[PDB]
């Protein structure tokens, strides 16, 4: 079916290959499905890179619905390596993960000359994920004939100053860029002839709910300013107060702090924890009821007393205002004259549902009754909405209050008065369906629900840009059937601010992309064994570029094997500090020295921002054991055979690796791999079984056969533990561990 | 006409996914009248019942369950001038339903039910 | 008890050694950090000016010392090229390379080498505290994605592992600070039939 | 019919800088 502007886009992409940036929610899955339907042939094989299992299953099922033989097949690590060559020879669309594709391309267990193309969904991941760049470099190194089409929503991902569209565009080997924003003439003119009957209600917050938000925002602003003060390099505009409200703030704070985490300090990590807690406090305030908010507030103070997690801001003069306001929301102490206030959004939802039911009970004869779909943010909100509708405000709030707090009857009845002051068959009646949006996991899940149940009315209890665009596209797909979308938003809150910031960020990102596109218009063999987890970095790509091939295996001893007697552990300054303090590096050195004749430790420092590697304030004090320099000296003193390589960048590390093997023989896999039941004994509960006291290897291995699960493990008494374990002391220790309070 | 309807079976409600195949080059979806909708459920009454029944005792078996009636094994039931082809696909979304007329809860069957019909020769 | 060679009299690094007593005296290496531990000093600008100087020192050092640490004071703006040759030479000559970015740091390294002559390896190995709270914390952190703070809040809410076992799937999610995904992962780990698979 | 959150998504209006901000969110 497609559309008009969508078919123009498809024709343009069937022309000279390139990458397509659409507006958030403008049916990128539809374009991917169109290309999959095009390439479901058995005489060709294309690879789709970044897709979720749910999206892949939906695509396969829809293609089966259409009546297509030779459906797409999914290839994952579970399939045996020799069997993976079978599905490649079968042709057709192949859903593959980055890791197995890297392994297959490097080991040449894939007909790289038979690949007719590659489709890169979510092409904005090329910016930071070095695996896909390596896959595309390897593919272009062998085929040079197949196509590369890339699709992406999230035009904001190119708006950050760290990245550049030209670099990622060159990584994809495309050389042509297609921009399809929401204000594009072809799409805007077409979407104006099939617009939905949107009606939005601006629900006003309670004055008590406003004070809580004001206090939380004050605390968040203070913590952000403190974080900026301690990290002058973090003064970037990406950490403004209006950006901390948004969803993707955690990703930016990780990108700016994760590479140098262990050298950050003590207060900075606590400040990041406070930022996360304040953001989840904002979410709880805007989303859930009053009793749940009070529960989270009180539990937050409970752990501060026990450990002191939030001691920085929990005792602030503004924080006490939040506690008092929450208590006034739930309690009233003059004996508890409970208030149990409900947030206004439920009343707006009730009014909307009443109007919808009135319309249905007025116009049954004009077709069917019509179905209503309610979209909420997550599962908790959906459950709360269903309980509120089925029970009522009073019963629901009383149930929550009694379940959590102390159950009272004499005080409860006083509040009630003040508040007042068939087995089988087709339903053939209006149905209300509550659906969790889950925007972060897979935004294109609202489209599947919309196509599964065709709703005459949609209530957007929680709204994001992608869902608005999806509802706009869904209506235009049916030119005759109308729908009315209700847009419930909290007036003058952080939800409205977040939505408006998303709007303006997308618009400015698309304008910047347009300008960037305009400006750019005119322009013997040797091997190294590389650990699998090391491909999330640029070093394996730079090593391969120098002309030496890579054999990727799972290495339990070291990251690189340059020679038969050599082993390199790659540690940055942050990871070196973390491993020295943790104690992992000592065990790694022990194993490497035991197994390899020439163990090597590689440290990658930063010439631009060097780290002192010595404790601050100890420059003039005595030698401190907690210092990193002292720990490094101790380690090199206890391992005289260990050799250390210092490199300033991954580019220099590759050169050193190439030079370090000038005449030595090459290594081989299955020898470093074999350096070091397994199929049984699920890794999940195995570690939990191992870590509690009373079990080293033999007693635990014996006991897990007798006991079906750890669920009933707590049921056994001390004597049964003595009988099963074989000892009474360890059994007593385990029983005391499993049955003890917090004291 | 033909809209994706819902069928109740015990404590659950199954959200069927009706798909009318095109009627030749000049597709006429109006051939599926209101009457033609009524025998679809009774023809498939045992199919849904045999699919809900084993979904309950596997929970009583306290272990994860497969449909044992999947894409590779469709249901090809005949009829009266029309065809039927039905699978049972996992949905993956926790949908919740309430009968607004009675304000009574109703669980949604987690397995998506899809049936395709076409004019018989 | 550090015997510094007379060949380094006018060098500021000896000004910053304070916590250990150092004296002169002829020695084959630049520094003698006790028995079976000797050190050599190098400067990046010196190395660039005299590329063949340090190799003679390495060749004349011999295999008398069990541990031979050659620490350099990187001072040039671009040490990328020289560090490569230095690392390769240290690899070939069976000696360890240490980087100090300031004269103070090199003195600290020398003092620490002298002061840690018979320090046991306890400072390096993991602690693994046997306290009940620490034990339950590490046991909880064994799951895929749960940090220490999450286990800290989790312990306070329920108290005992028996209470954690008894709780269903939903009330794990209802606990603050977990969310749906982390609570679901913990609940799946909290009881899974490992024997079936 | 002043549903400006919806047609504001189309990004086709003038929509000066202050329109992308909420007055109550200044502190």
PDB file of N, CA, C and O in Angstrom, chain A residues 19-26 28 121-125 127-128 151-160 163 165 179-180 248 251 439-440 443-444 465-466 469 502 505-506 509-510 513:
ATOM      1  N   UNK A  19      21.369   7.306   2.918  1.00  0.00           N
ATOM      2  CA  UNK A  19      20.760   7.115   4.225  1.00  0.00           C
ATOM      3  C   UNK A  19      19.616   8.103   4.386  1.00  0.00           C
ATOM      4  O   UNK A  19      19.705   9.251   3.941  1.00  0.00           O
ATOM      5  N   UNK A  20      18.539   7.648   5.019  1.00  0.00           N
ATOM      6  CA  UNK A  20      17.300   8.406   5.136  1.00  0.00           C
ATOM      7  C   UNK A  20      17.086   8.766   6.597  1.00  0.00           C
ATOM      8  O   UNK A  20      17.107   7.887   7.467  1.00  0.00           O
ATOM      9  N   UNK A  21      16.880  10.050   6.869  1.00  0.00           N
ATOM     10  CA  UNK A  21      16.550  10.534   8.204  1.00  0.00           C
ATOM     11  C   UNK A  21      15.110  11.020   8.166  1.00  0.00           C
ATOM     12  O   UNK A  21      14.798  12.014   7.501  1.00  0.00           O
ATOM     13  N   UNK A  22      14.233  10.329   8.883  1.00  0.00           N
ATOM     14  CA  UNK A  22      12.832  10.705   8.975  1.00  0.00           C
ATOM     15  C   UNK A  22      12.561  11.396  10.304  1.00  0.00           C
ATOM     16  O   UNK A  22      13.371  11.364  11.231  1.00  0.00           O
ATOM     17  N   UNK A  23      11.399  12.032  10.387  1.00  0.00           N
ATOM     18  CA  UNK A  23      10.936  12.559  11.660  1.00  0.00           C
ATOM     19  C   UNK A  23      10.574  11.413  12.593  1.00  0.00           C
ATOM     20  O   UNK A  23      10.260  10.305  12.154  1.00  0.00           O
ATOM     21  N   UNK A  24      10.630  11.683  13.897  1.00  0.00           N
ATOM     22  CA  UNK A  24      10.360  10.652  14.890  1.00  0.00           C
ATOM     23  C   UNK A  24       8.969  10.065  14.707  1.00  0.00           C
ATOM     24  O   UNK A  24       7.968  10.754  14.916  1.00  0.00           O
ATOM     25  N   UNK A  25       8.898   8.799  14.317  1.00  0.00           N
ATOM     26  CA  UNK A  25       7.633   8.117  14.183  1.00  0.00           C
ATOM     27  C   UNK A  25       6.986   8.188  12.820  1.00  0.00           C
ATOM     28  O   UNK A  25       5.809   7.835  12.699  1.00  0.00           O
ATOM     29  N   UNK A  26       7.708   8.621  11.792  1.00  0.00           N
ATOM     30  CA  UNK A  26       7.129   8.728  10.453  1.00  0.00           C
ATOM     31  C   UNK A  26       7.286   7.432   9.666  1.00  0.00           C
ATOM     32  O   UNK A  26       7.717   7.430   8.515  1.00  0.00           O
ATOM     33  N   UNK A  28       9.284   4.628   9.768  1.00  0.00           N
ATOM     34  CA  UNK A  28      10.530   4.029   9.300  1.00  0.00           C
ATOM     35  C   UNK A  28      10.418   2.515   9.216  1.00  0.00           C
ATOM     36  O   UNK A  28      11.008   1.893   8.320  1.00  0.00           O
ATOM     37  N   UNK A 121      19.110  -0.707   9.754  1.00  0.00           N
ATOM     38  CA  UNK A 121      18.111  -0.043  10.571  1.00  0.00           C
ATOM     39  C   UNK A 121      18.784   0.656  11.745  1.00  0.00           C
ATOM     40  O   UNK A 121      19.830   0.224  12.232  1.00  0.00           O
ATOM     41  N   UNK A 122      18.175   1.751  12.194  1.00  0.00           N
ATOM     42  CA  UNK A 122      18.721   2.579  13.268  1.00  0.00           C
ATOM     43  C   UNK A 122      20.164   2.976  12.965  1.00  0.00           C
ATOM     44  O   UNK A 122      21.098   2.652  13.698  1.00  0.00           O
ATOM     45  N   UNK A 123      20.330   3.694  11.856  1.00  0.00           N
ATOM     46  CA  UNK A 123      21.658   4.056  11.380  1.00  0.00           C
ATOM     47  C   UNK A 123      22.358   5.068  12.270  1.00  0.00           C
ATOM     48  O   UNK A 123      23.556   5.297  12.083  1.00  0.00           O
ATOM     49  N   UNK A 124      21.656   5.688  13.217  1.00  0.00           N
ATOM     50  CA  UNK A 124      22.322   6.607  14.129  1.00  0.00           C
ATOM     51  C   UNK A 124      23.226   5.891  15.123  1.00  0.00           C
ATOM     52  O   UNK A 124      23.999   6.557  15.818  1.00  0.00           O
ATOM     53  N   UNK A 125      23.149   4.562  15.207  1.00  0.00           N
ATOM     54  CA  UNK A 125      24.032   3.797  16.075  1.00  0.00           C
ATOM     55  C   UNK A 125      25.444   3.671  15.523  1.00  0.00           C
ATOM     56  O   UNK A 125      26.352   3.309  16.275  1.00  0.00           O
ATOM     57  N   UNK A 127      27.242   6.046  14.910  1.00  0.00           N
ATOM     58  CA  UNK A 127      28.000   7.156  15.480  1.00  0.00           C
ATOM     59  C   UNK A 127      28.920   6.662  16.588  1.00  0.00           C
ATOM     60  O   UNK A 127      30.106   7.010  16.636  1.00  0.00           O
ATOM     61  N   UNK A 128      28.394   5.834  17.490  1.00  0.00           N
ATOM     62  CA  UNK A 128      29.140   5.419  18.666  1.00  0.00           C
ATOM     63  C   UNK A 128      29.459   3.933  18.723  1.00  0.00           C
ATOM     64  O   UNK A 128      30.372   3.552  19.462  1.00  0.00           O
ATOM     65  N   UNK A 151      18.418   3.494   7.226  1.00  0.00           N
ATOM     66  CA  UNK A 151      17.256   4.252   7.663  1.00  0.00           C
ATOM     67  C   UNK A 151      17.419   4.631   9.125  1.00  0.00           C
ATOM     68  O   UNK A 151      18.019   3.892   9.908  1.00  0.00           O
ATOM     69  N   UNK A 152      16.873   5.784   9.494  1.00  0.00           N
ATOM     70  CA  UNK A 152      16.934   6.206  10.887  1.00  0.00           C
ATOM     71  C   UNK A 152      15.887   7.270  11.165  1.00  0.00           C
ATOM     72  O   UNK A 152      15.734   8.218  10.392  1.00  0.00           O
ATOM     73  N   UNK A 153      15.166   7.096  12.268  1.00  0.00           N
ATOM     74  CA  UNK A 153      14.509   8.202  12.948  1.00  0.00           C
ATOM     75  C   UNK A 153      15.579   8.911  13.759  1.00  0.00           C
ATOM     76  O   UNK A 153      16.773   8.712  13.516  1.00  0.00           O
ATOM     77  N   UNK A 154      15.174   9.745  14.710  1.00  0.00           N
ATOM     78  CA  UNK A 154      16.108  10.337  15.659  1.00  0.00           C
ATOM     79  C   UNK A 154      17.120  11.227  14.937  1.00  0.00           C
ATOM     80  O   UNK A 154      18.328  10.990  14.955  1.00  0.00           O
ATOM     81  N   UNK A 155      16.593  12.260  14.279  1.00  0.00           N
ATOM     82  CA  UNK A 155      17.458  13.286  13.714  1.00  0.00           C
ATOM     83  C   UNK A 155      18.194  14.061  14.795  1.00  0.00           C
ATOM     84  O   UNK A 155      19.158  14.766  14.487  1.00  0.00           O
ATOM     85  N   UNK A 156      17.754  13.949  16.048  1.00  0.00           N
ATOM     86  CA  UNK A 156      18.432  14.620  17.151  1.00  0.00           C
ATOM     87  C   UNK A 156      19.799  13.999  17.404  1.00  0.00           C
ATOM     88  O   UNK A 156      20.721  14.681  17.865  1.00  0.00           O
ATOM     89  N   UNK A 157      19.963  12.710  17.099  1.00  0.00           N
ATOM     90  CA  UNK A 157      21.224  12.028  17.369  1.00  0.00           C
ATOM     91  C   UNK A 157      22.400  12.666  16.645  1.00  0.00           C
ATOM     92  O   UNK A 157      23.541  12.516  17.092  1.00  0.00           O
ATOM     93  N   UNK A 158      22.155  13.363  15.540  1.00  0.00           N
ATOM     94  CA  UNK A 158      23.204  14.085  14.838  1.00  0.00           C
ATOM     95  C   UNK A 158      23.376  15.513  15.335  1.00  0.00           C
ATOM     96  O   UNK A 158      24.320  16.188  14.913  1.00  0.00           O
ATOM     97  N   UNK A 159      22.494  15.988  16.216  1.00  0.00           N
ATOM     98  CA  UNK A 159      22.534  17.376  16.659  1.00  0.00           C
ATOM     99  C   UNK A 159      23.594  17.634  17.721  1.00  0.00           C
ATOM    100  O   UNK A 159      23.976  18.792  17.926  1.00  0.00           O
ATOM    101  N   UNK A 160      24.081  16.597  18.398  1.00  0.00           N
ATOM    102  CA  UNK A 160      25.121  16.793  19.396  1.00  0.00           C
ATOM    103  C   UNK A 160      26.408  17.275  18.736  1.00  0.00           C
ATOM    104  O   UNK A 160      26.761  16.843  17.636  1.00  0.00           O
ATOM    105  N   UNK A 163      29.399  14.679  17.626  1.00  0.00           N
ATOM    106  CA  UNK A 163      29.348  13.946  16.372  1.00  0.00           C
ATOM    107  C   UNK A 163      29.309  14.897  15.177  1.00  0.00           C
ATOM    108  O   UNK A 163      29.197  16.117  15.314  1.00  0.00           O
ATOM    109  N   UNK A 165      27.702  14.660  10.939  1.00  0.00           N
ATOM    110  CA  UNK A 165      26.973  13.831   9.984  1.00  0.00           C
ATOM    111  C   UNK A 165      27.894  13.337   8.876  1.00  0.00           C
ATOM    112  O   UNK A 165      27.705  12.235   8.350  1.00  0.00           O
ATOM    113  N   UNK A 179      16.717  13.815   3.452  1.00  0.00           N
ATOM    114  CA  UNK A 179      16.098  14.344   4.659  1.00  0.00           C
ATOM    115  C   UNK A 179      14.600  14.466   4.430  1.00  0.00           C
ATOM    116  O   UNK A 179      14.167  15.119   3.475  1.00  0.00           O
ATOM    117  N   UNK A 180      13.813  13.846   5.306  1.00  0.00           N
ATOM    118  CA  UNK A 180      12.355  13.849   5.209  1.00  0.00           C
ATOM    119  C   UNK A 180      11.764  14.252   6.552  1.00  0.00           C
ATOM    120  O   UNK A 180      11.256  13.406   7.298  1.00  0.00           O
ATOM    121  N   UNK A 248      16.485  11.197  27.559  1.00  0.00           N
ATOM    122  CA  UNK A 248      17.823  10.717  27.188  1.00  0.00           C
ATOM    123  C   UNK A 248      18.955  11.380  27.954  1.00  0.00           C
ATOM    124  O   UNK A 248      20.109  11.312  27.522  1.00  0.00           O
ATOM    125  N   UNK A 251      21.762   8.915  29.131  1.00  0.00           N
ATOM    126  CA  UNK A 251      22.715   8.476  28.117  1.00  0.00           C
ATOM    127  C   UNK A 251      23.844   9.483  27.940  1.00  0.00           C
ATOM    128  O   UNK A 251      25.009   9.099  27.803  1.00  0.00           O
ATOM    129  N   UNK A 439       7.864   3.777  25.339  1.00  0.00           N
ATOM    130  CA  UNK A 439       8.463   4.494  24.225  1.00  0.00           C
ATOM    131  C   UNK A 439       9.928   4.182  24.005  1.00  0.00           C
ATOM    132  O   UNK A 439      10.400   4.178  22.865  1.00  0.00           O
ATOM    133  N   UNK A 440      10.673   3.932  25.083  1.00  0.00           N
ATOM    134  CA  UNK A 440      12.110   3.714  24.945  1.00  0.00           C
ATOM    135  C   UNK A 440      12.419   2.341  24.362  1.00  0.00           C
ATOM    136  O   UNK A 440      13.320   2.207  23.526  1.00  0.00           O
ATOM    137  N   UNK A 443       9.352   2.129  20.245  1.00  0.00           N
ATOM    138  CA  UNK A 443       8.269   3.091  20.005  1.00  0.00           C
ATOM    139  C   UNK A 443       7.225   2.594  19.026  1.00  0.00           C
ATOM    140  O   UNK A 443       6.046   2.937  19.170  1.00  0.00           O
ATOM    141  N   UNK A 444       7.613   1.790  18.038  1.00  0.00           N
ATOM    142  CA  UNK A 444       6.659   1.332  17.038  1.00  0.00           C
ATOM    143  C   UNK A 444       5.908   0.100  17.518  1.00  0.00           C
ATOM    144  O   UNK A 444       5.796  -0.889  16.789  1.00  0.00           O
ATOM    145  N   UNK A 465       6.413  12.415  21.077  1.00  0.00           N
ATOM    146  CA  UNK A 465       6.389  12.830  19.679  1.00  0.00           C
ATOM    147  C   UNK A 465       6.169  11.647  18.746  1.00  0.00           C
ATOM    148  O   UNK A 465       5.390  11.736  17.786  1.00  0.00           O
ATOM    149  N   UNK A 466       6.848  10.530  19.010  1.00  0.00           N
ATOM    150  CA  UNK A 466       6.750   9.383  18.117  1.00  0.00           C
ATOM    151  C   UNK A 466       5.329   8.843  18.065  1.00  0.00           C
ATOM    152  O   UNK A 466       4.850   8.444  16.999  1.00  0.00           O
ATOM    153  N   UNK A 469       3.156  11.173  15.910  1.00  0.00           N
ATOM    154  CA  UNK A 469       3.390  10.949  14.487  1.00  0.00           C
ATOM    155  C   UNK A 469       2.821   9.610  14.033  1.00  0.00           C
ATOM    156  O   UNK A 469       2.323   9.491  12.908  1.00  0.00           O
ATOM    157  N   UNK A 502      11.418  18.505  23.232  1.00  0.00           N
ATOM    158  CA  UNK A 502      11.585  17.517  22.171  1.00  0.00           C
ATOM    159  C   UNK A 502      11.217  18.104  20.816  1.00  0.00           C
ATOM    160  O   UNK A 502      11.942  17.916  19.828  1.00  0.00           O
ATOM    161  N   UNK A 505      13.949  20.632  19.760  1.00  0.00           N
ATOM    162  CA  UNK A 505      15.204  19.955  19.470  1.00  0.00           C
ATOM    163  C   UNK A 505      15.151  19.264  18.120  1.00  0.00           C
ATOM    164  O   UNK A 505      16.100  19.354  17.335  1.00  0.00           O
ATOM    165  N   UNK A 506      14.042  18.585  17.819  1.00  0.00           N
ATOM    166  CA  UNK A 506      13.928  17.933  16.520  1.00  0.00           C
ATOM    167  C   UNK A 506      13.920  18.952  15.387  1.00  0.00           C
ATOM    168  O   UNK A 506      14.581  18.753  14.358  1.00  0.00           O
ATOM    169  N   UNK A 509      17.450  20.338  14.977  1.00  0.00           N
ATOM    170  CA  UNK A 509      18.334  19.317  14.432  1.00  0.00           C
ATOM    171  C   UNK A 509      18.110  19.146  12.939  1.00  0.00           C
ATOM    172  O   UNK A 509      19.067  18.986  12.175  1.00  0.00           O
ATOM    173  N   UNK A 510      16.851  19.175  12.501  1.00  0.00           N
ATOM    174  CA  UNK A 510      16.590  19.024  11.074  1.00  0.00           C
ATOM    175  C   UNK A 510      17.078  20.233  10.287  1.00  0.00           C
ATOM    176  O   UNK A 510      17.610  20.083   9.181  1.00  0.00           O
ATOM    177  N   UNK A 513      20.785  19.788   9.985  1.00  0.00           N
ATOM    178  CA  UNK A 513      21.086  18.768   8.987  1.00  0.00           C
ATOM    179  C   UNK A 513      20.927  19.316   7.577  1.00  0.00           C
ATOM    180  O   UNK A 513      21.721  18.995   6.685  1.00  0.00           O
TER     181      UNK A 513
END
